[PDB]
Paper text:
The primary function of NP is to encapsidate the viral genome, consisting of eight segments of single-stranded negative-sense RNA, into viral ribonucleoprotein complexes (vRNPs). Our results demonstrate that NLS2 is an atypical monopartite NLS that binds weakly to the major NLS-binding site of importin α and synergize with NLS1 to confer high avidity for certain importin α isoforms.
To visualize the interaction of NLS2 with importin α, we co-crystallized mouse importin α1 lacking the N-terminal importin-β-binding domain26 (ΔIBB-importin α1) with peptides spanning NLS2-K (198-KRGINDRNFWRGENGRKTR−216) and NLS2-R (198-KRGINDRNFWRGENGRRTR-216). Clear electron density for NLS2-K/R was observed at the major NLS site of importin α, and, to a lesser extent, at the minor NLS-pocket. We unambiguously interpreted 8 residues for NLS2-K at the major NLS-pocket and only 5 for NLS2-R, supporting the idea that a K at position 214 of NP-NLS2 results in higher affinity for importin α. The residues visible at the major site correspond to the C-terminal basic box of NLS2, which validates the mutagenesis analysis in Fig. 2B,C, and confirms NLS2 is a monopartite NLS. To decipher why an R at position 214 results in decreased association with importin α and reduced nuclear import of 5GFP as compared to NLS-K, we carried structural alignment of NLS2 with other classical [name] solved in complex with importin α. The lack of K at P2 in NLS2-K is likely compensated by K214, at position P3, which provides a register for correct positioning of the NLS at the major NLS-binding pocket. Finally, position P5 is occupied by R216, which is sandwiched between W142 and W184. Increasing the concentration of NLS2-K peptide to ~215 µM, we obtained saturable data, which we fit to a one independent binding site model, with Kd = 72.4 ± 10.0 µM.
Residue numbers in the entry:
A (entry chain C): 75 to 497
B (entry chain B): 212 to 216
C (entry chain A): 209 to 216
Write the structure that this text describes.
Protein backbone atom coordinates (compact mmCIF):
# COMPACT_ATOMS: atom_id res chain seq x y z
CA UNK A 1 0.00 0.00 0.00
CA UNK A 2 1.70 3.14 -1.27
CA UNK A 3 1.79 6.60 0.21
CA UNK A 4 0.40 9.48 -1.83
CA UNK A 5 3.95 10.83 -2.11
CA UNK A 6 5.18 7.62 -3.75
CA UNK A 7 2.20 7.65 -6.12
CA UNK A 8 3.05 11.21 -7.17
CA UNK A 9 6.68 10.20 -7.72
CA UNK A 10 5.72 7.27 -9.94
CA UNK A 11 3.22 9.26 -12.00
CA UNK A 12 5.71 12.13 -12.47
CA UNK A 13 8.36 9.65 -13.67
CA UNK A 14 7.38 9.83 -17.37
CA UNK A 15 7.93 6.05 -17.40
CA UNK A 16 4.71 4.51 -18.68
CA UNK A 17 5.11 1.27 -16.73
CA UNK A 18 6.07 3.21 -13.60
CA UNK A 19 2.98 5.40 -14.10
CA UNK A 20 0.83 2.28 -14.54
CA UNK A 21 2.05 0.75 -11.28
CA UNK A 22 1.59 4.09 -9.50
CA UNK A 23 -1.93 4.49 -10.90
CA UNK A 24 -2.86 0.96 -9.82
CA UNK A 25 -1.54 1.76 -6.34
CA UNK A 26 -3.75 4.86 -6.38
CA UNK A 27 -6.73 2.72 -7.44
CA UNK A 28 -6.13 0.40 -4.48
CA UNK A 29 -5.93 3.32 -2.04
CA UNK A 30 -9.21 4.74 -3.37
CA UNK A 31 -10.80 1.27 -3.02
CA UNK A 32 -10.41 1.06 0.77
CA UNK A 33 -13.49 0.62 2.93
CA UNK A 34 -12.22 2.94 5.67
CA UNK A 35 -11.73 6.57 4.57
CA UNK A 36 -10.37 6.54 1.00
CA UNK A 37 -7.90 9.47 0.78
CA UNK A 38 -9.84 11.15 -2.03
CA UNK A 39 -9.01 14.69 -0.90
CA UNK A 40 -5.30 13.89 -0.54
CA UNK A 41 -5.16 12.53 -4.10
CA UNK A 42 -7.03 15.59 -5.37
CA UNK A 43 -4.70 18.04 -3.61
CA UNK A 44 -1.69 16.22 -5.09
CA UNK A 45 -2.87 17.26 -8.57
CA UNK A 46 -3.28 13.69 -9.82
CA UNK A 47 -6.68 14.06 -11.53
CA UNK A 48 -5.35 15.74 -14.73
CA UNK A 49 -2.77 12.96 -15.12
CA UNK A 50 -5.43 10.27 -14.60
CA UNK A 51 -7.56 11.88 -17.32
CA UNK A 52 -4.60 11.96 -19.71
CA UNK A 53 -4.09 8.22 -19.12
CA UNK A 54 -7.68 7.57 -20.27
CA UNK A 55 -6.52 8.36 -23.82
CA UNK A 56 -3.54 5.97 -23.87
CA UNK A 57 -5.18 3.55 -26.28
CA UNK A 58 -1.97 1.50 -26.58
CA UNK A 59 -1.85 0.82 -22.81
CA UNK A 60 -5.34 -0.41 -21.93
CA UNK A 61 -4.24 -1.44 -18.39
CA UNK A 62 -3.45 2.19 -17.57
CA UNK A 63 -6.78 3.23 -19.11
CA UNK A 64 -8.57 0.80 -16.79
CA UNK A 65 -6.70 1.77 -13.62
CA UNK A 66 -7.19 5.52 -14.07
CA UNK A 67 -10.85 5.07 -15.03
CA UNK A 68 -11.37 3.04 -11.85
CA UNK A 69 -9.42 5.58 -9.79
CA UNK A 70 -11.41 8.48 -11.26
CA UNK A 71 -14.66 6.57 -10.74
CA UNK A 72 -14.03 6.33 -6.99
CA UNK A 73 -13.21 10.05 -6.80
CA UNK A 74 -16.38 10.94 -8.71
CA UNK A 75 -18.40 8.80 -6.28
CA UNK A 76 -17.56 11.18 -3.43
CA UNK A 77 -18.88 14.63 -2.57
CA UNK A 78 -20.14 17.16 -5.10
CA UNK A 79 -16.83 19.03 -4.87
CA UNK A 80 -14.91 15.79 -5.47
CA UNK A 81 -17.10 14.97 -8.47
CA UNK A 82 -16.53 18.54 -9.68
CA UNK A 83 -12.77 17.96 -9.55
CA UNK A 84 -13.16 15.00 -11.92
CA UNK A 85 -15.29 17.08 -14.30
CA UNK A 86 -12.95 20.07 -14.02
CA UNK A 87 -10.12 17.76 -15.12
CA UNK A 88 -11.81 17.14 -18.46
CA UNK A 89 -12.95 13.59 -17.70
CA UNK A 90 -16.42 13.74 -19.31
CA UNK A 91 -15.33 13.67 -23.00
CA UNK A 92 -12.52 11.25 -22.13
CA UNK A 93 -14.91 8.76 -20.50
CA UNK A 94 -17.34 9.09 -23.41
CA UNK A 95 -14.53 8.09 -25.78
CA UNK A 96 -13.92 5.03 -23.57
CA UNK A 97 -17.48 3.78 -24.17
CA UNK A 98 -16.22 2.50 -27.54
CA UNK A 99 -13.39 0.48 -25.98
CA UNK A 100 -13.13 -3.12 -27.25
CA UNK A 101 -12.41 -4.18 -23.65
CA UNK A 102 -15.68 -4.69 -21.79
CA UNK A 103 -14.19 -3.95 -18.36
CA UNK A 104 -12.88 -0.59 -19.59
CA UNK A 105 -16.12 0.38 -21.34
CA UNK A 106 -18.04 -0.69 -18.23
CA UNK A 107 -15.79 1.46 -16.04
CA UNK A 108 -16.56 4.46 -18.27
CA UNK A 109 -20.30 3.81 -17.92
CA UNK A 110 -19.84 3.69 -14.14
CA UNK A 111 -17.94 6.99 -14.06
CA UNK A 112 -20.50 8.80 -16.22
CA UNK A 113 -23.20 7.48 -13.90
CA UNK A 114 -21.46 8.98 -10.87
CA UNK A 115 -20.99 12.29 -12.69
CA UNK A 116 -24.57 12.51 -13.96
CA UNK A 117 -25.78 11.49 -10.50
CA UNK A 118 -24.41 14.67 -8.92
CA UNK A 119 -27.31 16.80 -10.13
CA UNK A 120 -29.15 18.25 -13.08
CA UNK A 121 -26.23 20.44 -14.19
CA UNK A 122 -23.69 17.62 -14.52
CA UNK A 123 -26.43 15.36 -15.90
CA UNK A 124 -27.17 17.87 -18.67
CA UNK A 125 -23.45 18.45 -19.25
CA UNK A 126 -22.93 14.70 -19.72
CA UNK A 127 -25.79 14.78 -22.24
CA UNK A 128 -24.33 17.81 -24.03
CA UNK A 129 -21.04 15.96 -24.50
CA UNK A 130 -23.05 13.32 -26.39
CA UNK A 131 -23.04 10.35 -24.01
CA UNK A 132 -26.52 9.01 -24.83
CA UNK A 133 -25.72 7.66 -28.31
CA UNK A 134 -22.68 5.51 -27.33
CA UNK A 135 -24.41 4.37 -24.13
CA UNK A 136 -27.45 3.24 -26.12
CA UNK A 137 -25.26 1.57 -28.75
CA UNK A 138 -23.91 -0.73 -26.03
CA UNK A 139 -27.46 -2.07 -25.56
CA UNK A 140 -28.25 -2.42 -29.29
CA UNK A 141 -28.60 -6.21 -29.22
CA UNK A 142 -31.77 -8.17 -30.08
CA UNK A 143 -31.79 -9.97 -26.70
CA UNK A 144 -30.46 -8.35 -23.52
CA UNK A 145 -29.89 -11.80 -21.98
CA UNK A 146 -26.73 -12.15 -24.11
CA UNK A 147 -25.04 -9.28 -22.25
CA UNK A 148 -23.03 -9.79 -19.07
CA UNK A 149 -25.08 -9.40 -15.90
CA UNK A 150 -22.87 -6.81 -14.18
CA UNK A 151 -22.40 -4.94 -17.46
CA UNK A 152 -26.17 -4.70 -17.92
CA UNK A 153 -26.80 -3.57 -14.34
CA UNK A 154 -24.27 -0.74 -14.61
CA UNK A 155 -25.75 0.53 -17.88
CA UNK A 156 -29.25 0.49 -16.37
CA UNK A 157 -28.07 2.41 -13.29
CA UNK A 158 -26.21 5.02 -15.36
CA UNK A 159 -29.13 5.55 -17.75
CA UNK A 160 -31.29 5.88 -14.63
CA UNK A 161 -29.15 8.76 -13.35
CA UNK A 162 -29.60 10.50 -16.71
CA UNK A 163 -33.34 10.47 -15.90
CA UNK A 164 -33.07 11.88 -12.35
CA UNK A 165 -32.99 15.37 -10.79
CA UNK A 166 -35.78 17.81 -11.69
CA UNK A 167 -35.20 21.60 -11.64
CA UNK A 168 -34.71 21.25 -14.50
CA UNK A 169 -36.03 17.90 -15.66
CA UNK A 170 -33.87 16.12 -18.26
CA UNK A 171 -34.15 17.47 -21.81
CA UNK A 172 -37.26 16.30 -23.64
CA UNK A 173 -35.41 14.84 -26.63
CA UNK A 174 -33.00 13.09 -24.26
CA UNK A 175 -35.86 11.34 -22.46
CA UNK A 176 -37.40 10.69 -25.88
CA UNK A 177 -34.19 9.01 -27.08
CA UNK A 178 -33.72 7.07 -23.83
CA UNK A 179 -37.24 5.80 -23.28
CA UNK A 180 -37.47 2.79 -25.71
CA UNK A 181 -34.30 1.27 -24.25
CA UNK A 182 -35.59 1.94 -20.73
CA UNK A 183 -38.76 -0.01 -21.55
CA UNK A 184 -36.63 -2.97 -22.69
CA UNK A 185 -34.86 -2.93 -19.32
CA UNK A 186 -38.22 -2.68 -17.53
CA UNK A 187 -39.03 -6.10 -19.04
CA UNK A 188 -35.68 -7.78 -18.29
CA UNK A 189 -35.60 -10.74 -15.90
CA UNK A 190 -32.96 -9.35 -13.51
CA UNK A 191 -34.11 -7.98 -10.13
CA UNK A 192 -31.49 -5.22 -10.01
CA UNK A 193 -32.14 -4.16 -13.62
CA UNK A 194 -35.85 -4.12 -12.77
CA UNK A 195 -35.34 -1.94 -9.69
CA UNK A 196 -33.23 0.70 -11.43
CA UNK A 197 -35.49 0.75 -14.49
CA UNK A 198 -38.45 1.34 -12.17
CA UNK A 199 -36.61 4.17 -10.41
CA UNK A 200 -35.88 5.83 -13.76
CA UNK A 201 -39.54 5.57 -14.77
CA UNK A 202 -40.42 7.06 -11.38
CA UNK A 203 -38.07 9.98 -12.06
CA UNK A 204 -39.58 10.57 -15.51
CA UNK A 205 -43.14 10.52 -14.13
CA UNK A 206 -42.24 12.97 -11.32
CA UNK A 207 -43.28 15.92 -13.44
CA UNK A 208 -46.12 17.73 -15.21
CA UNK A 209 -48.78 15.76 -17.06
CA UNK A 210 -46.85 16.16 -20.33
CA UNK A 211 -43.95 14.20 -18.81
CA UNK A 212 -46.29 11.50 -17.46
CA UNK A 213 -47.87 11.18 -20.92
CA UNK A 214 -44.53 10.38 -22.58
CA UNK A 215 -44.12 7.42 -20.23
CA UNK A 216 -47.74 6.23 -20.35
CA UNK A 217 -47.76 6.40 -24.16
CA UNK A 218 -44.97 3.79 -24.19
CA UNK A 219 -47.32 1.25 -22.59
CA UNK A 220 -45.34 0.66 -19.39
CA UNK A 221 -48.30 0.86 -16.98
CA UNK A 222 -49.22 -2.86 -17.23
CA UNK A 223 -45.61 -3.83 -16.52
CA UNK A 224 -45.45 -1.33 -13.65
CA UNK A 225 -48.57 -2.95 -12.18
CA UNK A 226 -46.97 -6.38 -12.59
CA UNK A 227 -43.80 -5.24 -10.82
CA UNK A 228 -46.09 -3.67 -8.20
CA UNK A 229 -46.83 -7.21 -7.00
CA UNK A 230 -43.25 -8.46 -6.87
CA UNK A 231 -41.86 -10.06 -3.73
CA UNK A 232 -38.71 -7.90 -3.83
CA UNK A 233 -39.09 -4.68 -1.86
CA UNK A 234 -36.36 -2.99 -4.00
CA UNK A 235 -38.76 -3.47 -6.95
CA UNK A 236 -42.09 -2.65 -5.29
CA UNK A 237 -40.83 0.66 -3.89
CA UNK A 238 -39.89 2.28 -7.24
CA UNK A 239 -42.87 0.68 -9.00
CA UNK A 240 -45.30 2.10 -6.44
CA UNK A 241 -43.57 5.48 -6.69
CA UNK A 242 -43.99 5.44 -10.48
CA UNK A 243 -47.64 4.41 -10.12
CA UNK A 244 -48.20 7.13 -7.51
CA UNK A 245 -46.70 9.76 -9.81
CA UNK A 246 -48.90 8.75 -12.75
CA UNK A 247 -52.12 9.11 -10.73
CA UNK A 248 -51.20 12.74 -10.03
CA UNK A 249 -51.86 13.44 -13.72
CA UNK A 250 -55.11 13.65 -15.63
CA UNK A 251 -58.12 11.44 -14.97
CA UNK A 252 -57.39 9.60 -18.23
CA UNK A 253 -53.83 8.85 -17.12
CA UNK A 254 -55.20 7.70 -13.76
CA UNK A 255 -57.67 5.48 -15.63
CA UNK A 256 -54.83 3.62 -17.39
CA UNK A 257 -53.49 2.64 -13.97
CA UNK A 258 -56.93 1.39 -12.91
CA UNK A 259 -57.46 -0.46 -16.20
CA UNK A 260 -54.15 -2.29 -15.70
CA UNK A 261 -55.51 -3.80 -12.47
CA UNK A 262 -53.49 -1.80 -9.94
CA UNK A 263 -56.32 -1.57 -7.39
CA UNK A 264 -56.21 -5.35 -6.83
CA UNK A 265 -52.72 -5.06 -5.29
CA UNK A 266 -53.62 -2.39 -2.72
CA UNK A 267 -55.19 -4.69 -0.06
CA UNK A 268 -51.66 -5.96 0.63
CA UNK A 269 -50.02 -2.60 -0.09
CA UNK A 270 -52.25 -0.80 2.42
CA UNK A 271 -51.34 -3.45 5.03
CA UNK A 272 -47.66 -3.70 4.09
CA UNK A 273 -45.30 -4.08 7.07
CA UNK A 274 -42.90 -1.56 5.50
CA UNK A 275 -44.11 1.80 6.82
CA UNK A 276 -43.12 3.71 3.69
CA UNK A 277 -45.02 1.31 1.42
CA UNK A 278 -48.21 1.96 3.39
CA UNK A 279 -47.64 5.72 3.26
CA UNK A 280 -47.01 5.75 -0.50
CA UNK A 281 -49.89 3.37 -1.22
CA UNK A 282 -52.22 5.59 0.82
CA UNK A 283 -50.91 8.69 -0.94
CA UNK A 284 -51.65 6.95 -4.24
CA UNK A 285 -55.18 6.22 -3.01
CA UNK A 286 -55.74 9.88 -2.10
CA UNK A 287 -54.96 10.87 -5.69
CA UNK A 288 -57.33 8.20 -7.04
CA UNK A 289 -60.18 9.26 -4.73
CA UNK A 290 -59.63 12.77 -6.12
CA UNK A 291 -60.71 11.46 -9.54
CA UNK A 292 -64.09 10.96 -11.16
CA UNK A 293 -67.07 9.35 -9.46
CA UNK A 294 -66.69 6.25 -11.64
CA UNK A 295 -63.09 5.99 -10.43
CA UNK A 296 -64.17 6.31 -6.80
CA UNK A 297 -66.63 3.52 -7.60
CA UNK A 298 -63.71 1.33 -8.69
CA UNK A 299 -62.12 1.91 -5.28
CA UNK A 300 -65.43 0.84 -3.72
CA UNK A 301 -65.78 -2.24 -5.93
CA UNK A 302 -62.26 -3.47 -5.10
CA UNK A 303 -63.20 -3.43 -1.40
CA UNK A 304 -60.60 -0.75 -0.65
CA UNK A 305 -62.78 1.48 1.55
CA UNK A 306 -62.45 -0.87 4.58
CA UNK A 307 -58.68 -0.75 4.05
CA UNK A 308 -58.73 3.05 4.15
CA UNK A 309 -60.74 2.78 7.38
CA UNK A 310 -58.07 0.47 8.79
CA UNK A 311 -55.17 2.73 7.80
CA UNK A 312 -57.01 5.69 9.32
CA UNK A 313 -57.59 3.70 12.53
CA UNK A 314 -54.06 2.35 13.03
CA UNK A 315 -50.93 3.31 11.07
CA UNK A 316 -47.85 5.48 11.26
CA UNK A 317 -48.99 9.08 11.68
CA UNK A 318 -47.75 10.16 8.25
CA UNK A 319 -49.80 7.33 6.74
CA UNK A 320 -52.87 8.44 8.70
CA UNK A 321 -52.43 11.94 7.28
CA UNK A 322 -52.50 10.52 3.75
CA UNK A 323 -55.62 8.56 4.72
CA UNK A 324 -57.34 11.72 5.93
CA UNK A 325 -56.51 13.28 2.56
CA UNK A 326 -57.97 10.22 0.83
CA UNK A 327 -61.21 10.56 2.79
CA UNK A 328 -61.42 14.31 2.14
CA UNK A 329 -60.92 13.74 -1.60
CA UNK A 330 -63.43 10.86 -1.50
CA UNK A 331 -66.12 12.93 0.24
CA UNK A 332 -65.38 15.99 -1.93
CA UNK A 333 -66.03 14.30 -5.27
CA UNK A 334 -68.11 11.27 -4.33
CA UNK A 335 -71.82 10.72 -4.73
CA UNK A 336 -74.18 10.74 -1.75
CA UNK A 337 -74.48 6.95 -2.02
CA UNK A 338 -70.69 6.60 -2.01
CA UNK A 339 -70.38 8.89 1.03
CA UNK A 340 -73.11 6.92 2.81
CA UNK A 341 -71.18 3.73 2.07
CA UNK A 342 -68.08 5.34 3.60
CA UNK A 343 -69.95 6.05 6.84
CA UNK A 344 -71.35 2.51 6.87
CA UNK A 345 -67.78 1.17 6.74
CA UNK A 346 -67.03 2.97 10.02
CA UNK A 347 -65.08 6.04 8.93
CA UNK A 348 -66.52 8.37 11.58
CA UNK A 349 -64.91 7.10 14.78
CA UNK A 350 -61.29 6.89 13.50
CA UNK A 351 -61.89 10.27 11.84
CA UNK A 352 -62.93 11.76 15.19
CA UNK A 353 -60.01 10.11 17.00
CA UNK A 354 -57.47 11.92 14.80
CA UNK A 355 -58.82 15.34 15.83
CA UNK A 356 -56.49 15.03 18.86
CA UNK A 357 -53.33 15.18 16.73
CA UNK A 358 -51.36 18.37 17.31
CA UNK A 359 -50.62 18.61 13.58
CA UNK A 360 -52.75 21.55 12.42
CA UNK A 361 -53.03 20.47 8.76
CA UNK A 362 -54.67 17.10 9.42
CA UNK A 363 -57.28 18.84 11.59
CA UNK A 364 -58.25 21.12 8.70
CA UNK A 365 -58.37 18.10 6.38
CA UNK A 366 -60.60 16.12 8.75
CA UNK A 367 -62.94 19.07 9.38
CA UNK A 368 -63.27 19.38 5.60
CA UNK A 369 -64.33 15.74 5.28
CA UNK A 370 -66.90 16.04 8.08
CA UNK A 371 -68.41 19.04 6.29
CA UNK A 372 -68.70 17.07 3.04
CA UNK A 373 -70.35 14.16 4.85
CA UNK A 374 -72.82 16.58 6.43
CA UNK A 375 -73.66 17.95 2.98
CA UNK A 376 -74.53 14.40 1.92
CA UNK A 377 -76.54 14.15 5.15
CA UNK A 378 -78.53 17.30 4.35
CA UNK A 379 -79.50 15.92 0.93
CA UNK A 380 -80.90 12.75 2.54
CA UNK A 381 -82.36 14.45 5.62
CA UNK A 382 -80.22 12.50 8.13
CA UNK A 383 -78.27 15.62 9.17
CA UNK A 384 -79.23 14.90 12.80
CA UNK A 385 -78.56 11.14 12.81
CA UNK A 386 -74.96 11.90 11.82
CA UNK A 387 -74.64 14.49 14.61
CA UNK A 388 -75.45 11.74 17.13
CA UNK A 389 -72.76 9.46 15.68
CA UNK A 390 -70.13 12.18 16.13
CA UNK A 391 -71.49 12.81 19.64
CA UNK A 392 -71.50 9.17 20.73
CA UNK A 393 -67.89 8.40 19.78
CA UNK A 394 -66.57 11.48 21.59
CA UNK A 395 -66.11 13.63 18.48
CA UNK A 396 -68.42 16.39 19.72
CA UNK A 397 -66.15 17.30 22.62
CA UNK A 398 -63.21 17.41 20.25
CA UNK A 399 -64.76 19.92 17.84
CA UNK A 400 -65.61 22.21 20.77
CA UNK A 401 -61.92 22.28 21.70
CA UNK A 402 -60.94 23.18 18.13
CA UNK A 403 -63.03 26.33 18.55
CA UNK A 404 -60.32 27.55 20.95
CA UNK A 405 -57.50 26.95 18.46
CA UNK A 406 -54.93 29.46 17.24
CA UNK A 407 -55.17 28.67 13.52
CA UNK A 408 -57.90 30.72 11.86
CA UNK A 409 -58.96 28.00 9.40
CA UNK A 410 -59.86 25.50 12.14
CA UNK A 411 -61.16 28.55 14.04
CA UNK A 412 -64.12 28.99 11.69
CA UNK A 413 -64.22 25.35 10.47
CA UNK A 414 -65.27 24.32 13.98
CA UNK A 415 -67.91 26.94 14.84
CA UNK A 416 -69.57 26.32 11.46
CA UNK A 417 -70.56 22.73 12.26
CA UNK A 418 -71.43 23.58 15.87
CA UNK A 419 -73.82 26.31 14.70
CA UNK A 420 -75.39 24.22 11.93
CA UNK A 421 -75.57 20.60 13.12
CA UNK A 422 -75.36 20.64 16.94
CA UNK A 423 -76.60 23.98 18.29
CA UNK B 1 -57.32 17.93 -5.87
CA UNK B 2 -54.15 16.03 -6.76
CA UNK B 3 -51.40 16.10 -4.19
CA UNK B 4 -48.14 15.80 -6.05
CA UNK B 5 -45.27 14.63 -3.85
CA UNK C 1 -30.88 1.09 -5.65
CA UNK C 2 -31.72 4.79 -5.59
CA UNK C 3 -28.29 6.16 -4.66
CA UNK C 4 -26.64 8.98 -6.57
CA UNK C 5 -23.15 7.49 -6.72
CA UNK C 6 -21.52 4.09 -6.20
CA UNK C 7 -17.94 3.54 -5.13
CA UNK C 8 -16.17 0.52 -6.56
Amino acid sequence: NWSVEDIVKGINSNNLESQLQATQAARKLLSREKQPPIDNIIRAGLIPKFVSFLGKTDCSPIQFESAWALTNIASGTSEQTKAVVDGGAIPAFISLLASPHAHISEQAVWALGNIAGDGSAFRDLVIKHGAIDPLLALLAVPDLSTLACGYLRNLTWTLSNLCRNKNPAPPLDAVEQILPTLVRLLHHNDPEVLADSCWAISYLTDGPNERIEMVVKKGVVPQLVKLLGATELPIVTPALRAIGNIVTGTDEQTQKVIDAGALAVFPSLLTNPKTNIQKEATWTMSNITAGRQDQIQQVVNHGLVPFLVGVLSKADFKTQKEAAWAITNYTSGGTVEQIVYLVHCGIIEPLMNLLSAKDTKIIQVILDAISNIFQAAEKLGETEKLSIMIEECGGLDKIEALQRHENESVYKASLNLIEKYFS
Amino acid sequence: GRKTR
